[PDB]
Design a protein around this nucleic acid. Structure first.
Lengths: 422, 147, 266
RNA sequence: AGCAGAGUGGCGCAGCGGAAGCGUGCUGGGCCCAUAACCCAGAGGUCGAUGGAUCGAAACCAUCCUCUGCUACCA
RNA sequence: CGAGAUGGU
């Protein structure tokens, strides 16, 4: 399955494809009859292995040469060793986090399903790049301290401008996160130095505690593969959920459920909403089928549901567990909150409305996030630090420790702060 | 080849881009035609009916124009090769839908044909009003409202 | 040879013709449903309004539709007109001609048996079977093409008379080589997406309950434009008969999930 | 993947179960003192593979191939 | 009461 799961995180115009291939061998993609843009804009994945010879290097699947293919005019090459037998370090897979702040709820969810972060940096915009606070301040508030930095698109950038970038970032983080994350430089075009990223995901990142025998918990985000061909047109395979198990051993034929579920039809409102449950039909990980599974790793879980739920990611940010589980389900929320010391998202040569956030009012709709879920929140009562709200879809957590808060401060919602349940 | 929608702006990164407009000169003297070949694709790229940009050339040049559902030819009568259109290919933007506050023709029209009025609105800075009363094409638009 | 019952055309009806020459008073023409007999269209009968050139109304070797305005039986004189003909009557003329050309293409080929020395065999093969198969129906408006279509579904039509084996097989083939694509002409449209958490077991009845009392071998054909737009074929029946099976199938498709705690728009 | 088009004889639009189909473009001739309008005539010819009825196949019917178009998915 | 514009030596 896996020992750890790593989120590749960044900002607009930094690229994706070359570096996500360099750390895994896998092209991150979403299927569309259209051209591939500079970024995978919405949350994805890349399956991987990490392995070495007897001496520090990251080989190709043929071990004798590191020979590249990302540039048409050159063959950059080194010898890891004289065709030595490779050794696996540990089982790992990557969470391909959103490329634009428009998906900030899905980004907080991606940052919750990872055990650690890779934060990606590029020369395409001015030095004090703001997402170095925006991700890492939320990541500290969701208590996930495990962080690394990766300087990607610098193929034509001088060492003094590469310095000015990391040094204006090092000055900027003083109010938002600890400086203690290592930086790895690479080339995006030449695949130069990329095996140091592999070494640092062994060097910096620990294996986290989980309970192997306590009651099942799972986070789901992805509608996994089901396909059109068949002699019976309905329910040939059933819908498959892509997720990561938080807690408990899991097995084929076990009854599993999703906590927020759905609102029942012919209800007059938030009443009569219920969990949804079924027996697990199959399991998938590491390009193999399974009968059993464990906490701490990315997995596909097979279910009896209609594939019409799976033709798109309807299943973004959902919490799952054993049928009839305890954890409280919220369709309305009691909140206490705090707001960021600057407005955030983009920057240039001098101030662009970067002042402190204006207080909330009841005539508005929030986007609000808890655990690894998301919902839209409408106010019943509020003050500048405290409130009471009703939710357009239900949400769930094992404890009410934290929430994250986004406001329509302009045409689409931006993060403005965080809070707790009362 | 391809171009910016208007050449009064020299910027490579300007928001408006389109295919070339190419035409055939046909016939012989005392009976010459100029036929515009790309006109349906250019009208689709500019989000207007193909009658309006064709009619604007006849209003400026002082010439007859033809339209035909049987053959799909759009025609400006007489020889109008090279510079005779290409000095003024901007005009359908430059005399109608440039905002006076900023050079950004992200601009829409709405017609009230029962009350002799054409409404105008540009998304770039919120500029709104009507088309001009000395300008030619207003008498054609009110008799031919948009789809 | 003649395609029809009678030696000469009747007055004030439409014939298919081919143009041979043009002169000072009219165009000279051969009638096609008769044995290439001569007739003429006068230049006064071509149009209601002024003619810019004659060559774009008529040219030699082209097929044409015209009414017969006068006939003299004894001398063999026939007068033709084009000013009269409406476009519905031209379509009707092409249907009569196509239904006749197909029957004649059977009989001309079936005649290539015995001695076949003279057109006497063509006229002898046209008489009896093919003639008694449509002389009875001139007023209703059918031709022997419909009797041949009846002889395809049941050969008792042929068994009623003196017969030949080419006259059986060539007759059948000139329908069946074109009629054998008796293709699908009805399908259902359904908006259903399924609530059932037991669906991979439970929906296999809704996929198979669509008709009662079949063989266990009986197929149905099922289709999909996209997952929320389900489609089914009504047991390969034609659009003249499958309308009951269409209404039953869509009712059963919704019933075998509304029976199972689903709810949908009727 | 559901349904549709194309696979020149001359640019381009693709007729109908008869070997160009018609409106149009090109080239030449007539008419006039001359140019346009109008009139007339030309252009070397199995139109992707494999079967079958025909006097006949780009155009009556199967089975494969490929790209577009609208829906919209094995990816 | 069809259609019938124009003009380097």
């Amino acid at each position: 399955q896996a020992t750890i799961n790593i989120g590749t995180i960044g900002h607009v115009a930094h690229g994706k494809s070359t570096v996500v291939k360099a750390i895994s061998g896998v092209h991150t993609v979403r299927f569309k009859n259209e051209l591939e843009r500079n970024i995978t804009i919405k949350l994805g994945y890349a399956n991987a292995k990490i392995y070495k010879l007897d001496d520090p290097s990251c080989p190709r699947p043929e071990c004798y040469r590191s020979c590249g293919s990302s540039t048409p005019d050159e063959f950059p090459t080194d010898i890891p060793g004289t065709k030595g037998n490779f050794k696996l370090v540990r089982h790992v897979s990557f969470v391909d986090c959103p490329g634009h702040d428009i998906l900030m709820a899905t980004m907080l969810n991606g940052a919750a399903v990872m055990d650690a972060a890779l934060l990606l940096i590029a020369g395409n915009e001015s030095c004090p790049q703001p997402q170095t606070s925006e991700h890492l301040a939320a990541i500290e508030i969701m208590k996930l301290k495990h962080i690394l930095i990766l300087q990607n698109k610098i193929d034509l950038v001088k060492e003094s401008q590469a310095k000015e970038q990391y040094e204006q970032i090092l000055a900027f983080v003083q109010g938002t996160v600890a400086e203690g994350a290592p930086i790895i430089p690479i080339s995006a075009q030449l695949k130069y130095n990329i095996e140091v990223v592999c070494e640092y995901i062994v060097k910096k990142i620990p294996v986290p505690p989980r309970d192997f025998t306590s009651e099942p918990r799972l986070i789901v985000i992805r509608s996994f593969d089901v396909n059109k061909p068949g002699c019976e047109v309905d329910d040939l395979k059933g819908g498959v959920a892509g997720g990561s198990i938080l807690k408990g051993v899991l097995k084929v034929g076990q009854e599993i459920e999703v906590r927020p579920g759905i609102v029942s039809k012919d209800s007059e409102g938030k009443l009569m909403c219920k969990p949804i449950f079924s027996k697990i039909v199959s399991l998938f990980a590491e390009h193999n089928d399974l009968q059993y599974a464990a906490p701490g790793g990315l997995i596909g879980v097979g279910t009896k549901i209609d594939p019409t739920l799976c033709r798109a990611d309807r299943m973004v940010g959902q919490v799952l567990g054993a049928v009839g589980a305890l954890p409280e389900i919220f369709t309305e929320l009691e909140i206490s909150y705090f707001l960021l010391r600057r407005l955030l998202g983009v920057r240039t040569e001098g101030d662009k409305k970067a002042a402190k956030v204006q207080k909330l009012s009841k005539n508005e709709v929030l986007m609000v996030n808890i655990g690894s879920l998301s919902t839209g929140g409408r106010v019943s009562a509020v003050k500048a630090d405290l409130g009471k709200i009703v939710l357009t879809n239900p949400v769930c957590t094992e404890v009410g420790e934290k929430i994250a808060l986004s406001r329509r401060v302009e045409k689409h919602w931006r993060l403005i702060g965080w809070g707790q349940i009362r | 080849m391809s171009v910016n929608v208007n050449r009064s702006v020299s910027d490579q990164f300007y928001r408006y881009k389109m295919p070339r407009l190419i035409a055939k000169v046909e016939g012989k003297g005392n009976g010459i035609k100029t036929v515009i070949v790309n006109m349906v694709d250019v009208a689709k790229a500019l989000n207007r009916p193909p009658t309006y940009p064709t009619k604007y050339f006849g209003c400026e040049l002082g010439a007859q124009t033809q339209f035909d559902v049987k053959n799909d030819r759009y025609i400006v009568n007489g020889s109008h090769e090279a510079n005779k259109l290409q000095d003024m290919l901007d005009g359908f933007i430059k005399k109608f839908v440039l905002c006076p506050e900023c050079e950004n023709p992200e601009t829409d029209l709405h017609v009230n044909p029962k009350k002799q009025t054409i409404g105008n609105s540009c998304k770039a800075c919120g500029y709104r009003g009507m088309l001009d009363t000395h300008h030619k094409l207003c008498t054609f638009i009110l008799k031919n409202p948009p789809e | 040879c003649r395609f029809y019952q009678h030696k000469f055309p009747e007055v004030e009806d439409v014939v298919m013709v081919n143009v041979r020459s043009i002169a000072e008073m009219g165009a000279y023409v051969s009638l096609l449903e008769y044995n290439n007999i001569e007739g003429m269209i006068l230049l006064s009968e071509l149009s209601r309004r002024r003619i810019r050139s004659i060559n774009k109304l008529i040219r030699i070797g082209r097929n044409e539709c015209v009414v017969v305005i006068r006939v003299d039986k004894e001398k063999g004189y026939i007068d033709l007109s084009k000013r009269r003909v409406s476009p519905e009557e031209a379509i009707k003329c092409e249907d009569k001609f196509t239904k006749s050309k197909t029957v004649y293409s059977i009989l001309r080929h079936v005649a290539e048996v015995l001695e076949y020395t003279k057109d006497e065999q063509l006229e002898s093969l046209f008489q009896r079977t093919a003639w008694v198969f449509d002389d009875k129906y001139k007023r209703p408006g059918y031709g022997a093409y419909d009797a041949f279509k009846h002889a395809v579904s049941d050969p008792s039509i042929l068994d009623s008379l003196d017969l030949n084996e080419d006259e059986r097989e060539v007759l059948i083939n000139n329908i069946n080589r074109r009629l054998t694509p008796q293709a699908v002409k009805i399908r259902a449209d359904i908006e259903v997406a399924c609530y059932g958490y037991e669906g991979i077991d439970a929906v296999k009845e809704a996929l198979r309950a669509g008709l009662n009392c079949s063989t266990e071998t009986m197929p149905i054909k099922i289709n999909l434009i996209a997952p929320p737009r389900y489609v089914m074929t009504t047991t390969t029946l034609e659009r003249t008969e499958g309308l009951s099976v269409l209404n039953q199938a869509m009712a059963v498709i919704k019933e075998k999930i509304e029976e199972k705690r689903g709810v949908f728009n009727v």
